[PDB]
Design a protein around this ligand. Structure first.
Ligand SMILES: Cc1nnc(-c2ccccc2)nc1O
Length: 133
């Protein structure tokens, strides 16, 4: 029942500061513009110890599967090759991506009927709110 309240299909309903987050990460202009337009669905499922998170959008369809605490290699939607570790901290899924001596953290939390995503790169935070599809 690890992650039960995250499981399901979620749709993006608001975003704040995502262009600035992507700038801080190093995403180039054209990718920022097209990716910033995307309205992804986030599909989260669990099978035993394996969690799968799919993001489907007009921009890209991606999928990661992982075990909490166990590092994996990830190719991000903007084509970074990162080393990722996802843990559960006090009911929050915390996803750290490391590449080129840089690091960013993506937190996913349940708040009321929403799934709130906070993306942080240095001093820049973007907040993305998802609702059940
Ligand atoms: C957590 C999360 N991960 N990926 C995206 C995404 C995917 C494709 C294009 C733009 C953004 N948005 C998020 O909110």
């Amino acid at each position: 029942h690890m992650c039960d309240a995250f499981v399901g299909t979620w749709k993006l309903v608001s975003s704040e500061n995502f262009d600035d987050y992507m700038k801080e990460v190093g995403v180039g202009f054209a990718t920022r513009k097209v990716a910033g337009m995307a309205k992804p669905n986030m599909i989260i499922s669990v099978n035993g110890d394996v969690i799968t998170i799919k993001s489907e959008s007009t921009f890209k369809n991606t999928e990661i599967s992982f075990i909490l605490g166990q590092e994996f290699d990830e190719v991000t939607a903007d084509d970074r090759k990162v080393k990722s570790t996802i843990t559960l901290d006090g009911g929050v899924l915390v996803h750290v991506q490391k590449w080129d001596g840089k690091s960013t953290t993506i937190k996913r939390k349940r708040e009321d009927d929403k799934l709130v995503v906070e993306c942080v790169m240095k001093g820049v935070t973007s907040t993305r709110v998802y609702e059940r599809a």
